[PDB]
Amino acid sequence: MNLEPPKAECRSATRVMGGPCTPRKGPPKCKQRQTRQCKSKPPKKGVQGCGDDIPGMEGCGTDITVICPWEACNHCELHELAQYGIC
Ligand SMILES: *[C@H]1CC(=O)N([C@@H]2CC(C)(C)N(O)C2(C)C)C1=O
Ligand SMILES: *[C@H]1CC(=O)N([C@@H]2CC(C)(C)N(O)C2(C)C)C1=O
Ligand SMILES: *[C@H]1CC(=O)N([C@@H]2CC(C)(C)N(O)C2(C)C)C1=O
Ligand SMILES: *[C@H]1CC(=O)N([C@H]2CC(C)(C)N(O)C2(C)C)C1=O
Ligand SMILES: *[C@H]1CC(=O)N([C@H]2CC(C)(C)N(O)C2(C)C)C1=O
Ligand SMILES: *[C@H]1CC(=O)N([C@H]2CC(C)(C)N(O)C2(C)C)C1=O
Ligand SMILES: *[C@H]1CC(=O)N([C@H]2CC(C)(C)N(O)C2(C)C)C1=O
Ligand SMILES: *[C@H]1CC(=O)N([C@H]2CC(C)(C)N(O)C2(C)C)C1=O
Ligand SMILES: *[C@H]1CC(=O)N([C@H]2CC(C)(C)N(O)C2(C)C)C1=O
């Protein structure tokens, strides 16, 4: 019968859940990664981004699985004002 009962609980959490939350049009519309969300300045390197090809296999995995900016949220090279979330 379907997969075995999933761990839909995890008590490890505590206050990092609940509270005033109201999604919007559900998560972004993927199924077509191209240029429907990523937009700003012409394609280049560093200033803009990098222009990879198939992330999750060669784009990233080290500065995220071992040290993700979410932990030491303070260093960050550029774009430090994005800390307010006013994005
Ligand atoms: C799955 C297990 C779990 O509980 N996780 C963490 C820790 C708590 C606080 C329990 N969560 O709800 C989050 C997702 C933050 C898991 O990732
Ligand atoms: C409300 C919906 C939600 O889940 N939110 C965030 C992100 C996750 C990890 C799903 N949470 O349980 C918290 C509350 C941290 C919301 O903003
Ligand atoms: C984006 C909220 C940016 O300021 N919020 C989100 C998440 C990241 C990846 C940081 N972004 O640039 C978008 C807009 C997708 C702002 O800081
Ligand atoms: C299709 C939509 C998208 O952007 N995406 C991401 C989601 C995660 C799991 C973060 N990832 O590494 C991929 C590239 C799969 C999709 O699967
Ligand atoms: C370098 C190649 C590229 O287009 N890019 C974008 C992709 C997303 C995840 C939208 N983004 O915010 C960056 C700047 C990473 C690269 O990383
Ligand atoms: C945002 C839109 C997108 O798919 N993208 C690419 C750019 C690079 C860094 C090559 N990459 O692996 C992602 C998926 C982030 C953006 O810059
Ligand atoms: C660069 C390519 C990518 O999508 N990615 C992950 C890493 C974490 C921080 C887990 N994450 O939510 C994104 C989508 C940025 C990279 O390391
Ligand atoms: C940055 C590095 C990474 O992969 N990551 C995870 C952490 C949670 C909140 C579980 N998540 O869905 C992302 C992809 C953001 C980071 O904090
Ligand atoms: C530290 C905590 C966090 O997740 N974060 C954002 C800031 C930007 C650069 C917008 N981003 O994509 C991450 C996830 C690093 C912080 O400033």
From Swiss-Prot:
Question: What reaction is this protein's catalytic activity?
Answer: 3',5'-cyclic GMP + H2O = GMP + H(+)
The biased composition feature labelled Basic residues covers 26-44
GO molecular function annotation: 3',5'-cyclic-GMP phosphodiesterase activity; cGMP binding; molecular adaptor activity; zinc ion binding
Annotated S-S bridges: none
User: Listed GO cellular component terms?
Assistant: photoreceptor disc membrane; photoreceptor outer segment membrane
Group of enzyme by EC: hydrolase
Under the heading Pfam families, the entry gives: PDE6_gamma
Q: Which residues carry this modification: N-acetylmethionine?
A: M1
Region ranges (Disordered)? 1-55
Keywords assigned by UniProt, alphabetized: Acetylation, cGMP, Hydrolase, Sensory transduction, Vision
Q: Where is the composition biased (Basic and acidic residues)?
A: 1-12
**What Enzyme Commission number(s) does the record list for this chain?**
3.1.4.35
Does the keyword Ribonucleoprotein feature in the UniProt annotation? no
Q: Which GO terms describe its biological process?
A: positive regulation of epidermal growth factor receptor signaling pathway; positive regulation of G protein-coupled receptor signaling pathway; positive regulation of MAPK cascade; visual perception
Q: Which family does it belong to?
A: Belongs to the rod/cone cGMP-PDE gamma subunit family.
Role: Participates in processes of transmission and amplification of the visual signal. cGMP-PDEs are the effector molecules in G-protein-mediated phototransduction in vertebrate rods and cones.
Quaternary form?
Oligomer composed of two catalytic chains (alpha and beta), an inhibitory chain (gamma) and the delta chain.
Protein's UniProt name? Retinal rod rhodopsin-sensitive cGMP 3',5'-cyclic phosphodiesterase subunit gamma
